[PDB]
């Protein structure tokens, strides 16, 4: 199952519901607008979400999640606003 | 409270899989706590150890929380057939906010952390490092 | 990119949420398409987060509709055992709704800037502008106990004695009204960690056992 | 294995795990699920090299490649009627690192 | 060749006097340099070692030399009367010039050396980060 | 205790040490062994304050103001007549920092 989350650049992500679910915001917030975060920054939420789901309490090492420094401070801000 | 048991009865453990340099820390017979070498990721160390002694560890520059077995504390146990002890140390999961944050205090010099465009309580966030003492009250 | 959403759109549009706020099919679908994405982008807006324009308009607005609610149940004493209670399902499943939507206001602005009580009580703040900086649901909440509950306890509390004394002398009183006012004193302080009963006992189990006793010992 | 993906068509994007042992045609039922168009009216590309129904997401995507927390891109282009668009509107670019970065 | 002896008999020994955070090393059984827990400026510690083992200080951010007891290495002894071997750890007396390059190696970023205006072998001089098991060549 | 001085004069600087207890004569003395000029024809000054005859070099030049890689300067005007000349020409400024430093 799946919802849609739609960035400021008007990039529709369309992802496992309970990929979405993990952020309390979006909880709080089934076709999410996000006027305030581009797709770039929403594309690598999507990826926080896979990694969170891929690797919490997995029996592969865990590599380090890596955020790219310019969206690390927009994602930062996704981060903080999503929670 | 959280104070090492003198037992005096020795225990070999193997110590790192994470990107991080990994700070040991042993808290003493009177409860200060003492670092011991640090392990850059994937290294191994065989060291020696005592039963019912309490092990944490940090990351060595930012001082971050690290998990050991996948927990936040480590005591050796029996060498059982002379065997020495893992502890596999690892990263927890932390918070896509303090993903973040770890960023931001790391490029950022805290001289300038008001300066930051951003409401009191994420300056007071950025001030309240991963405070190691603080963490022992919670512990306790 | 991060961005600011002035408070009328994201405000006005809440507003009507949490007036509409007694369903969560608008929660469910609409604020996840529609009213988050208006108050999400100004929540924590860029720039500077009109979260606090929002959490004060917001307040203003739930003291409002507490009162146009106690207004109904003030008149209506003997409804206060009915509409108090109703109300205060309308308008806590509303306090919930609230904080499905809010869980961004309430962890991005609120929560960050959020005071302890103790630091309000002991002579600190900036959160407790017009009520203390709590989750909108724990305000909602607050506020119900301030604004409904506390001015109409000695009815609430005489009815529901009344009619479990006449349901002890047989008669059938409206079950249902009562549990849910009965539980409306529970869930009003349920936010609070030191003691999320005390309300319940000291406003409503003590002068219930009182009366019970009274009964028995006469039956 | 899990393998990780986005899935970008013009300005559609879906992220979502499927198995490295999974199909083209599976992704393009949970594609369906998704945006609610069906597997036929569904191009899929690795990244943009257009996939096979029958071929396995492991025939590039690994989950190693298509990594949980740096996914691979799954190009999708819709068919509108007869033939498919021509395959995804890029991800924006972020702004420039402040001085003090 | 230079390597701690596995005699297994035991030494307590009193590990600061100088103004750098000291980096002690353990030349280990096979000859190899495992580095220990630093002492910041004037700190002490207590610690346990064995009779015919080899250690060696080094300061902790330049990886420069530092004498113990006025000798470059230090080895422990029996504990006579159960009382801990003192480990006096000082500067040396530098050449001028070594105290000349110590100061430029640590403030310019080794990239920027072949710019400066000094003779060439100076280069040479300053691209000698005070390499360890150099000095273990040099020793031996 | 040993104090570290540089008696200068105009030009001139001698650098030696001296015990802290020892005096200001016995500096006069050192001075007069060096340049030739009788102690009571030195005004020597603990760096710029006149310093009497049977004065210890610690009544500043202690081991720790006065040491041997920070030395005191130990002023020195020579004798005009019954007169001291006007107490040090000082040492030259270095030149602005490399950017690289």
């Not at chain 2, 940090?58 to 002379?82: I, K, M």
């Not at chain 3, 999400?40 to 004060?56: I, M």
């Not at chain 3, 005489?158 to 349901?167: G, H, P, Q």
């Not at chain 4, 083209?24 to 699920?33: A, H, M, P, Q, S």
Request: a negative charge; hydrophobic letters at 35%; charged letters at 25%.
């Amino acid at each position: 199952m799946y919802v849609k989350l739609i960035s400021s650049d008007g990039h529709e992500f369309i992802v496992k519901r309970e990929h979405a679910l993990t952020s309390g915001t979006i909880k709080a917030m089934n076709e999410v607008n996000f006027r305030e975060i581009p797709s770039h920054v929403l594309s690598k939420v999507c990826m926080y979400f896979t990694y969170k789901v891929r690797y919490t309490n997995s029996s592969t090492e865990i590599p380090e999640f890596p955020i790219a420094p310019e969206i690390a401070l927009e994602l930062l801000m996704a981060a903080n606003f999503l929670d | 409270v959280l104070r090492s048991v003198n037992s005096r009865e020795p225990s070999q453990v193997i110590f790192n899989r994470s990107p991080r340099v990994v700070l040991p820390v042993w808290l003493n017979f009177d409860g200060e706590p003492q670092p011991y070498p640090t392990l850059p990721p994937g290294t191994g160390r065989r060291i020696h150890s005592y039963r019912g002694h309490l092990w944490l560890f940090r990351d060595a520059g930012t001082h971050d929380g690290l998990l050991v077995n996948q927990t936040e504390l480590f005591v050796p146990s029996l060498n059982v057939d002379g065997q020495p002890i893992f502890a596999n140390i690892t990263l927890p999961v932390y918070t896509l906010k303090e993903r973040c944050l770890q960023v931001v205090r790391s490029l950022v010099k805290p001289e300038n952390y008001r300066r930051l465009d951003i409401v009191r309580s994420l300056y007071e966030d950025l001030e309240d490092h991963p405070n190691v003492q603080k963490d022992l009250e919670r512990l306790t | 990119k991060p961005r600011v959403v002035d408070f009328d759109e994201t405000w006005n549009k809440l507003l009507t949420t949490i007036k509409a706020v007694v369903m969560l099919e608008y929660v469910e679908r609409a604020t996840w398409n529609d009213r988050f994405s208006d108050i999400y982008a100004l929540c924590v807006a860029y720039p500077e987060p009109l979260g606090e324009r929002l959490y004060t308009e917001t307040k203003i607005f739930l003291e409002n509709h507490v009162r146009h609610l106690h207004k109904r149940v003030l008149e209506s004493e003997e409804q206060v055992l009915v509409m108090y209670h109703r109300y205060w399902e309308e308008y806590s499943k509303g306090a919930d709704y609230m904080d499905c939507l809010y869980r961004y206001l309430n962890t991005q602005f609120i929560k960050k800037n959020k005071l302890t009580e103790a630091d309000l009580q002991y002579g600190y703040g900036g959160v407790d502008m017009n009520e203390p900086l709590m989750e909108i649901g724990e305000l909602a909440l607050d506020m119900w106990r301030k604004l409904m509950v506390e001015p109409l306890q000695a009815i609430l509390i005489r009815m529901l004695l009344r009619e479990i004394k006449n349901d002890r002398g047989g008669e059938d009183p409206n079950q249902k009204v009562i549990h849910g006012v009965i539980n409306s004193f529970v869930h009003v302080e349920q936010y609070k960690k030191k003691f999320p009963l005390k309300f319940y006992q000291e406003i409503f189990e003590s002068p219930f056992l009182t009366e019970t006793g009274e009964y028995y010992k006469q039956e | 294995m899990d393998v990780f993906l986005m899935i970008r068509r013009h300005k559609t994007t879906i992220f979502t795990d499927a198995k490295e042992s999974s199909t083209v045609f599976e992704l393009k039922r949970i594609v369906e699920g998704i945006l609610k168009r069906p597997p036929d009216e569904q191009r899929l590309y690795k990244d943009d090299q257009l996939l096979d129904d029958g071929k396995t997401l492991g025939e590039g995507f690994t989950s190693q490649t298509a990594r949980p927390q740096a996914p691979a891109t799954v190009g999708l282009a819709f068919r509108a009627d007869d033939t498919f668009e021509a395959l995804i509107e890029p991800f924006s670019s972020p702004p420039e690192l402040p001085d003090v970065m």
